[PDB]
Design an enzyme around this catalytic site. Structure first.
Site, short mmCIF file in Angstrom:
data_model
loop_
_atom_site.label_atom_id
_atom_site.label_comp_id
_atom_site.label_asym_id
_atom_site.label_seq_id
_atom_site.Cartn_x
_atom_site.Cartn_y
_atom_site.Cartn_z
CD1 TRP A 53 7.13 5.41 8.30
CD2 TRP A 53 7.16 6.31 6.25
NE1 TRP A 53 7.91 4.61 7.50
CE2 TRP A 53 7.95 5.14 6.24
CE3 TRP A 53 7.04 7.05 5.07
CZ2 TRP A 53 8.61 4.69 5.09
CZ3 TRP A 53 7.70 6.60 3.93
CH2 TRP A 53 8.47 5.43 3.95
N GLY B 260 -2.30 5.58 2.51
CA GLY B 260 -3.69 5.15 2.36
C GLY B 260 -4.70 6.27 2.25
CB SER C 132 1.36 2.67 -0.47
OG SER C 132 0.60 1.75 0.27
CD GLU D 224 4.62 -4.30 -0.15
OE1 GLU D 224 4.22 -3.40 0.63
OE2 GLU D 224 5.25 -4.06 -1.21
CG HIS E 237 3.69 -0.91 2.88
ND1 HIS E 237 3.24 -1.19 1.61
CD2 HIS E 237 3.23 0.33 3.18
CE1 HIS E 237 2.54 -0.17 1.16
NE2 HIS E 237 2.51 0.77 2.10
#
Ligand SMILES: *[C@@H]1O[C@H](CO)[C@@H](O[C@@H]2O[C@H](CO)[C@@H](O)[C@H](O)[C@H]2NC(C)=O)[C@H](O)[C@H]1NC(C)=O
Ligand SMILES: *[C@@H]1O[C@H](CO)[C@@H](O[C@@H]2O[C@H](CO)[C@@H](O)[C@H](O)[C@H]2NC(C)=O)[C@H](O)[C@H]1NC(C)=O
Ligand SMILES: CC(=O)N[C@@H]1[C@@H](O)[C@H](O)[C@@H](CO)O[C@H]1O
Ligand SMILES: *[C@@H]1O[C@H](CO)[C@@H](O)[C@H](O)[C@H]1NC(C)=O
Ligand SMILES: *[C@@H]1O[C@H](CO)[C@@H](O)[C@H](O)[C@H]1NC(C)=O
Ligand SMILES: *[C@@H]1O[C@H](CO)[C@@H](O)[C@H](O)[C@H]1NC(C)=O
Ligand SMILES: *[C@@H]1O[C@H](CO)[C@@H](O)[C@H](O)[C@H]1NC(C)=O
Ligand SMILES: *[C@@H]1O[C@H](CO)[C@@H](O)[C@H](O)[C@H]1NC(C)=O
Ligand SMILES: *[C@@H]1O[C@H](CO)[C@@H](O)[C@H](O)[C@H]1NC(C)=O
Lengths: 530, 530, 246
Positions: free
Chosen positions: A79, A114, A195, A322, A435
């Site tokens: 990620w 986010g 997301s 999630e 998620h």
């Protein structure tokens, strides 16, 4: 190969994919590098160039703190950015099928994280598979994140908020002016994100600016109405100031605070970001979107209720698990490194981590709706329940509630509940269908034979086809390989298709009991205190 | 008489028709003669000429093998080309009523011949009768056929497939630019074709390219979804290569195979064509349409299901005996020269001729649904049944199924079942109302008094009027001579008008029992093996 | 069933399938339903490779051996089609593959699909019909784990035997209580809701939508078109392969 754009000629490369060819233009500039004076300002337009841009590398990821909880662990590093961090990061990629079509449908990827993190260049966002398999042009962009992308000083022209969103928007304008030169069809552009990339997409459904810049929209595990998605005007003020104080930027002449921060290092800004909020959560979005009056022209939370948005088809869905992803980043008793079985005391230790600024009734009520088991046996009781709390609350209920309020106004909405777990998944079984772990399937990663179970190659092939058919034709149906057709989500019946390797069914009213709680009982308990 | 077109002046002639006058422009070039280098490429645009074209002959038919099973037999020679075969064959005819209308509705004829054969210049496609009787401009074009019109090397720019379809398309563009000069109305163009000419029309309903090039559509005994109509991407590859091998064109540099075939004679190409397929059938379409990504932008077999096509009215129908025509070109026991009575063993001898690459259950199942007679007496039992197999399977069920899936999306569809047999028919009675034998009536041939029963002159007059009223007004009604009005074919009731000389009735669900079999039970038996 | 019901002319006046086709039956409410694993119970009594004393993890050839057992007079191709439908393995993994294949073959054909067909043909004439899918393995089950939610083993719960606080888990005593309330309610009021212990209400099986209620200790969902694919096969396709058979 060379392509002439409104700014100048660009040179791309030719990747080898599935015994055939795709053409890639990685890291095309689309805005003026937001440096020095421009930092914090909306993205400026870009001067022409008479040479050729060499769009053959991936470009810089934007500045962000990197996740360091599990160094060397693929589950978290898959990620992390995989390109040099730089404030000079406004670039986009384009993947075209070979041979140059024609009048191809365009898919645009908006990455999540986010609003604090993310990058276009991740391997799981590789657009080559889609382009080749479904003959679509895939496009993804980098946009600013954290305070550099979302510093709000309300109305103040040199710190307006929503900068990162404007970045996306300008990238969208690029595709509207330039995609035809590539063989793509500007009158069919599906936006898709995950997301915070889905909250983004949902915000473009509201944004007068974006309105004529795409046809349709896909919303994976996110929507603006989710609790993390949107910063209030005055949380944002408070945060911008707290930062100013954390860095020695306090002032009176308000513009000067912005002259002050303009002159600090990305790094003095970065380390302090995590500290501008009173108490955190693992989902704390310190610098996200705000009602800016320019991009969002009014509280989205209202525009929705009154039907003011682009009227078009939407694809929306969530994942079976999630909430688990977050538990290993704050919640006592949790480790990716054992079956994480937890005690009732710890469950509550957990509730204060995820709901710090909430009443004692708030928590004891959450506790009650989630912890009356038919057989209080399974040692995993609490462990599973803290995950669903975090899940249902921040992702599932918001998403379903969005799909309701929007489809209320006449448009087609399809909803999915994805629930197969990757055989390759680097996190442990208890975490389930986490998620962000459908993106592999959507981007067609299990299609690359040399890796995944054969079952997963079927599953990716479906989702891939379903997605393209939604982009091209406004219908996420998969007509050939005898499927079950995907019903439109209406407000009464509320149907959604389940995605997994061994039985897709049509089901109704996902999370009925649990969304009631989160959607009416709970917020009511909140009205009583604060 | 002279007419000025966007390429140059054209001179036509004046035919004497029904004690009045029609004006004919036969063999107008509409594309650049596809010679030498152009062979296999899409039709190039055409340079202006400052003299006058003498559009007063019929032009060359395109290259094709001619049918030689019954030399001298009119029944088969009335189908054979009646003009010099030539690769230089992209020409069109126009028939205008006299005196020059006005703002006339335009009928465009697309000839059939399983994409291997055919020509615009046949006597049964004489547009003079229609023009004069109904004051319409009739137009028909020649387009390439067989490998020269349909050689596919996927994506490869110098052998894209669907060349013959592009030919039709360019001819359609011609009418859009030039027809007004003739007195025709480009905003009313009905496309009409038969068999492979109907598959063609149906493909133009799908083709983004053709979409704005006509108003309405008539589909006689053919549709893309018929089993013969559309070559898969990789059957086509296989075929193109097999040809290369049959002619000494094998290579590695793939473009060279196309440079190789570019340099052979039409004749080295022609004789080999019949041999590029593993096992034939009398309906084998060796070089037909493929999903090319340019003309067809995606499998048609999907575009249909998802409603992506021109939304307009359609006229569609079949003949009582579509299947008999084929039985004399492969099926043991069959001769145009006696009552062709056949044995059960021979019926099965027949089934392997028409379904060579099919399971033993496939055939025994076909056998079962077609051969349980109420009274296994009539010596013609099997003979009739092999005909209906071939018919229902390749023509009737596909056509009805097309009309369903299309009218599902809101448009008007009318369906006919034509069932009168020509008194003039050169084939024997057992063959009944054969494939392609309504064209005479549609083109108004029994109107020419000096020939047909008086009953047939009534029958042609009806069909003629019904057709023109559909072209002009979108309604195949015949309002004067007290008819029965033609109901719109909806998905529930499924009404279709019967055409014959002595009782037109409204009937429902043509071939109910038989299409079920072909549409669900049979293809299911096929899933089990291959 | 060597000696069973026939059309005798006296108790059954005409063929039952006719009476049902043409709506000759007492017009009233019904509650219908089947168990997750009807079929399994019968595989121990003849089918090669089956024992109540082991894994029972069988091979393809004992699957076909097994088919010969349960479909004695069924054509060459007939059996082959039952083979194709139920052995559609995406991934050739599970050593337990053909074991469950056979379970389901016997269940869908002898119990579930005829039950489902029944409810439709009956509902078609406009009486309320309630369909259930009992999917809970009693903890007490003497039979092995692989036999699953077996034929017969929903009765314990309907008669209220898990209510006996002397034996069954506490959840089983909940499930039994609901079922007991639903069952008594239906009988009393023609409506098998459990209105108190906040249930999920049980909708009518209408001919169109095909809703049913799942019965378990756990996830109590309302669902639609049970065994939809399997019953198309048994309902129309297979009966069309029997018409060739003989
Ligand atoms: C799994 O691992 C976790 C974390 O390593 C264990 O949780 C720990 O519990 C004890 C007491 O609460 C402490 O040593 C640690 O501080 C805890 N972790 C933290 C930082 O919260 C947990 O017991 C393990 N669970 C098992 C064996 O199932
Ligand atoms: C009609 O004519 C056909 C063809 O001439 C006859 O079919 C022939 O049958 C015998 C044995 O099968 C052979 O002499 C020929 O080879 C057959 N034709 C072919 C090539 O298939 C048929 O018997 C005649 N039917 C009648 C008299 O009703
Ligand atoms: C591996 C396994 O468990 N298989 C055996 C099987 O061979 C035997 O015939 C059956 C009945 O006795 O019992 C079991
Ligand atoms: C990119 O590399 C190519 C090599 O083909 C070369 O033409 C060019 O110098 C480079 N482009 C730029 C931006 O100078
Ligand atoms: C692509 O398709 C759109 C309609 O979806 C059309 O208006 C446009 O002209 C087409 N563009 C090209 C270049 O084919
Ligand atoms: C359907 O067919 C086969 C599986 O039988 C598979 O290879 C193919 O990719 C499938 N197509 C889609 C689009 O799912
Ligand atoms: C066609 O014939 C006419 C006779 O009227 C003549 O004018 C002309 O030479 C011919 N046209 C061409 C193409 O030369
Ligand atoms: C013919 O009719 C169309 C409408 O069907 C109209 O728009 C057009 O202008 C007319 N043309 C002429 C020249 O009469
Ligand atoms: C109707 O009238 C007469 C037959 O009575 C016939 O001559 C005429 O052609 C008919 N018209 C049409 C259009 O069928």
């Amino acid at each position: 190969i060379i392509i002439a754009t409104k700014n100048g000629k660009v040179r791309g490369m030719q990747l080898t994919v599935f015994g055939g060819t795709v053409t890639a233009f990685l890291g095309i500039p689309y805005a003026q590098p937001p440096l020095g004076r421009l930092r914090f300002k909306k993205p400026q337009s870009l001067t022409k160039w008479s040479d050729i841009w060499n769009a053959t590398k991936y470009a810089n990821s934007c500045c962000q703190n990197i996740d360091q909880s599990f160094p060397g662990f693929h589950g978290s590093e898959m990620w992390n950015p995989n390109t040099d961090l730089s404030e000079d990061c406004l670039y986009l990629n384009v993947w075209i099928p070979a041979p140059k079509p024609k009048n191809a449908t365009v898919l645009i990827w908006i990455y999540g994280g986010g609003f604090q993190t993310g990058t276009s260049s991740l391997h799981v966002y590789d657009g080559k598979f889609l382009a080749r398999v479904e003959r679509v042009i895939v496009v993804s962009m980098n946009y600013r994140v954290g305070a550099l992308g979302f510093l709000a000083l309300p109305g103040n022209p040199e710190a307006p908020g929503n900068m990162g969103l404007f970045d996306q928007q300008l990238a969208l304008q690029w595709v509207q002016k330039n995609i035809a030169a590539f063989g793509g069809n500007p009158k069919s552009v599906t936006l898709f994100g995950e997301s915070a990339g889905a909250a983004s997409v949902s915000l473009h459904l509201l944004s007068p600016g974006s309105h004529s810049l795409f046809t349709r929209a896909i919303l994976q595990s996110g929507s603006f109405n989710a609790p993390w998605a949107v910063t209030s005007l005055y949380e944002a003020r408070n945060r911008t100031l707290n930062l100013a104080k954390l860095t020695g930027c306090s002032r009176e002449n308000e513009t000067e605070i912005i002259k002050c921060l303009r002159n600090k290092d990305p790094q003095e800004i970065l380390l302090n970001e995590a500290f501008v909020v009173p108490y955190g959560t693992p989902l704390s979005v310190n610098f996200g979107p705000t009602v800016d009056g320019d991009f969002l022209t009014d509280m989205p939370d209202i525009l929705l209720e009154l039907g003011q948005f682009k009227k078009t088809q939407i694809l929306v869905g969530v994942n079976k698990d999630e909430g688990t992803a977050f538990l290993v980043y704050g919640a006592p008793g949790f480790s990716k490194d054992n079956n994480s079985i937890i005690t009732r005391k710890e469950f509550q230790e957990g509730l204060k981590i995820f709901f710090p600024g909430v009443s004692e009734f708030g928590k004891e009520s959450i506790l009650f709706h989630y912890t009356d088991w038919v057989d209080d046996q399974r040692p995993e009781n609490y462990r599973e329940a803290l995950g669903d709390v975090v899940g249902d609350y921040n992702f599932i209920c918001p998403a379903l509630e969005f799909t309701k309020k929007f489809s209320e106004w006449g448009n087609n909405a399809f909803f999915y509940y994805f629930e197969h777990r990757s055989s390759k998944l680097p996190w442990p079984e208890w975490m389930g269908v986490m998620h962000g772990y459908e993106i592999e399937f959507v981007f067609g990663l299990p299609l690359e034979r040399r890796d995944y179970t054969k079952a997963e190659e079927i599953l990716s092939r479906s989702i891939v086809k379903r997605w393209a058919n939604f982009a091209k034709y406004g219908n996420p149906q998969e007509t050939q390989n005898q499927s079950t057709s995907w019903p439109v989500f209406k407000s009464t019946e509320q149907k959604y298709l389940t995605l997994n390797t061994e039985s897709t069914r049509i089901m109704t009213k996902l999370r009925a009991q649990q969304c009631r709680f989160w959607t009416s009982f709970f917020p009511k308990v909140l009205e009583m205190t604060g």
